């Protein structure tokens, strides 16, 4: 029962495959859908949650295991998300004008971040590797950054005149900022409304699954432009109604839970 230690494991290949842990993981787990208010609006019903639960009951998920948690908008959801279940599904509406916002949301929830705080007024911060990013949540973030040189003077910016800074975010609810790694920055942030945290990206989160209900797959999880990957828990549908989408999710939930796996942490 050792904790916090990484020990070599060992096994074999003449060992046989065990039984299907599905139809038991359902009973001993929990599922949480995150749908947009447009779904409920189009549906125009108030028993649809109990209906979907009675449907799920035919797939194996019991009554008090499934939950539906509403979110008014992508950005409102992005403002301080808290995904605490044993299996999370997220139905994301497509919007060209929200592409980077719903890419940052994906990069935030799909992945697992180790976050420390930030005191702008005191220290001058820097990034060490390609994983130490700066994630800022709040009602309206307006971020500006001045990189400094060897002698803590500005580079094309004045440490005093805040207006000379290089604005990288204008009134956004969620920002994920990657800057040049190896230089000391000084920031201006509307700290009254937004909280910023220096977060190092760890391995992925296998507990959540994004589903782009509409257009083509655009999500660029990796900040670096070379890879632009696509994972198993990043799905896509084409939609004209929402009952069909929820029926599809229900009928192919087992594929989703096969694409997902409980969290290591």
């Amino acid at each position: 029962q050792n904790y916090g230690i990484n020990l070599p494991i060992t096994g074999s290949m003449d060992t046989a495959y065990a039984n299907s842990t599905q139809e038991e993981t359902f009973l001993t787990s929990t599922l949480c859908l995150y749908y947009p208010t447009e779904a409920a609006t189009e549906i125009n019903d108030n028993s649809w949650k109990d209906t979907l639960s009675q449907l799920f009951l035919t797939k194996g998920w019991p009554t008090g295991s499934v939950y539906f948690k509403e979110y008014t908008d992508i950005a409102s959801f992005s403002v301080d998300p808290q995904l605490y279940c044993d299996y999370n599904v997220v139905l994301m509406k497509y919007d060209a004008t929200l592409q980077l916002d719903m890419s940052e949301l994906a990069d935030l929830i799909l992945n697992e971040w180790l976050c420390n705080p930030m005191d702008i007024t005191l220290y001058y911060y820097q990034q060490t590797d390609e994983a130490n990013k700066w994630i800022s949540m709040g009602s309206s973030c307006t971020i500006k950054v001045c990189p400094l040189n060897t002698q803590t003077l500005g580079i094309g910016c004045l440490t005093t005149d805040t207006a000379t800074f290089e604005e990288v975010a204008t009134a956004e609810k969620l920002v994920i900022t990657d800057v040049v790694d190896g230089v000391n920055h000084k920031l201006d942030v509307t700290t009254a409304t937004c909280t910023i945290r220096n977060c190092k990206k760890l391995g992925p989160r296998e507990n959540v699954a994004v589903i782009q209900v509409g257009g083509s797959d655009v999500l660029d999880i990796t900040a670096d432009p070379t890879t632009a990957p696509q994972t198993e828990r990043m799905m896509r549908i084409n939609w004209k109604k929402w009952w069909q989408v929820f029926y599809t999710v229900v009928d192919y939930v087992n594929q989703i839970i096969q694409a997902m796996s409980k969290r290591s942490r």
Binding site: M13, E130, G203, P204, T222
Partner: protein
């Protein structure tokens, strides 16, 4: 047992040399020996069998000696010789079959199949003709303790083991580091895999070590060492340790750097090989240490840089392999090979006559369970049955 070998040898040499027209100057000695054996046998009554489907046969020997009057050979001599030799051959075959099947933990060297306990007497000592074969020579050497040796071609000293070991594991099995190995017969195919191509590791390097411990010492071994293990170099779906779930493995083969093969003996190192591939030697070793590394290529073309990214997805997993085959070897003790039929003869006799399982050998005499626990009693019984199986093969192959 020496007298059993001598019986088999003089009977083989009789069926070979005693032929029509031949010259008595070539078989005078063998005929004196045959007459001596007949004299030493006449008046004894043996029994054989009674364990399993072996029939209980009773052997009586009342024969006549072979004349030395002739100066050339003929059919009225050969045919007498043959009608006398067939009986001794059936006797020897039934004795060897009654001896391959019996076991004991208490002095397994000491003969079973009590006909052989009788042949081990002092009056049967006048039958020894020449103990020239490898197995009987080593038997005599062991009885008179001395440095023995059995020479083997592709010996089966490694029990079948096909297994992995993960020094960095996850439930989703998406970023792994570990080593896989197949050790079978004379071959070791090992492969260390890292899914991140040693990006987060210091110096862009990941170590891998495989320790093998032999159950019996070997000497003068000729070994063929090559890179890029084959059976662990293609896509695969493997189970976890507890067998519940499965994981995928899509390999991309690289070369071992800083490779080091150490053949050790009692923990002290004996032979060491740095970046030498091909035909090598190992003079004395009970332990092997294959220590290699996975080095991230510092300079990479686009097509290969598009495979090892700085992020977790990792749809291509870098591997570093090694094949190692012990072609020839020498062992103080007895093993199985790809050249000799002794184990096959033993196992076939036992399967045919339905011998129950004994206190020493495992069921069906499976080499894996018989080498994994190679205790002195098992080694003794195995040497005994291999020797008598060789004896029986000298006559009936």
């Amino acid at each position: 047992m020496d007298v059993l070998y001598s019986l088999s040898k003089t009977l083989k040499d009789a069926r070979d040399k005693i032929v029509e027209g031949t010259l008595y100057s070539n078989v005078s000695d063998l005929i004196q020996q045959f007459n001596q054996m007949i004299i030493t046998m006449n008046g004894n009554e043996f029994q054989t069998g009674g364990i399993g489907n072996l029939p209980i046969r009773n052997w009586n020997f009342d024969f006549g000696l072979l004349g030395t009057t002739l100066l050339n050979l003929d059919a009225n001599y050969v045919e007498t010789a043959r009608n006398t030799i067939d009986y001794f051959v059936d006797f020897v075959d039934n004795v060897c079959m009654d001896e391959m099947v019996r076991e004991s933990q208490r002095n397994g060297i000491a003969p079973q199949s009590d006909s052989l306990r009788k042949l081990s007497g002092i009056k049967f000592k006048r039958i020894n003709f020449d103990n020239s074969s490898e197995y009987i020579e080593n038997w005599n050497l062991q009885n008179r303790r001395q440095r023995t040796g059995f020479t083997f071609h592709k010996p089966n000293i490694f029990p079948y083991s096909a297994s992995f070991t993960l020094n960095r594991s996850q439930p989703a099995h998406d970023n792994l580091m570990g080593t896989m190995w197949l050790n079978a017969g004379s071959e070791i195919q090992v492969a260390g895999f890292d899914y991140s191509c040693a990006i987060n590791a210091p110096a862009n390097i990941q170590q891998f070590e495989h320790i093998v411990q032999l159950r019996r010492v070997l000497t003068t071994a000729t070994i063929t060492l090559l890179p890029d293990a084959e059976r662990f170099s293609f896509p695969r779906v493997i189970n976890s340790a507890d067998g519940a779930t499965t994981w995928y493995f899509n390999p991309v083969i690289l070369r071992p750097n800083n490779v080091e093969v150490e053949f050790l003996l009692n923990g002290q190192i004996i032979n060491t090989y740095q970046a030498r591939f091909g035909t090598i030697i190992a003079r004395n070793f009970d332990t092997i240490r294959l220590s290699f590394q996975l080095m991230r290529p510092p300079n990479m073309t686009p097509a290969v840089a598009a495979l090892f990214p700085n992020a977790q997805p990792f749809e291509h997993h870098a591997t570093v392999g090694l094949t190692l085959r012990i072609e020839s070897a020498v062992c103080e003790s007895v093993l199985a090979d790809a050249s000799k039929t002794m184990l096959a003869n033993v196992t076939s006799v036992r399967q045919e006559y339905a011998i129950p399982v004994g206190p020493v050998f495992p069921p069906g005499m499976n080499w894996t369970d018989l080498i994994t626990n190679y205790s002195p009693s098992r080694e003794d019984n195995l040497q005994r049955v291999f020797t008598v199986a060789s004896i029986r093969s000298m006559l009936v192959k």
